[PDB]
Amino acid sequence: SAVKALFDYKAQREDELTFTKSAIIQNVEKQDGGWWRGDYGGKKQLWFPSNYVEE
């Protein structure tokens, strides 16, 4: 459900999260393809790279 960022990530497209290292991303929906959806920073269920986070 929640994950923690290992590195800063900056949204490159409208449908992506932006977060800083150590951030807690919530309500994570895992799927195939190396990107998951989650909640952070007022954005809901947007994409982020799964290799950016640990659980």
């Binding site: 590195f7 800063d8 990530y9 497209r13 393809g33 190396g34 990107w35 790279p49 290799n51 950016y52």
Partner: peptide, 10 residues
């Protein structure tokens, strides 16, 4: 040393 995001297709 940040990982490469798997590049997204159009």
């Amino acid at each position: 040393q940040p990982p490469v995001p798997p590049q997204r297709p159009m």
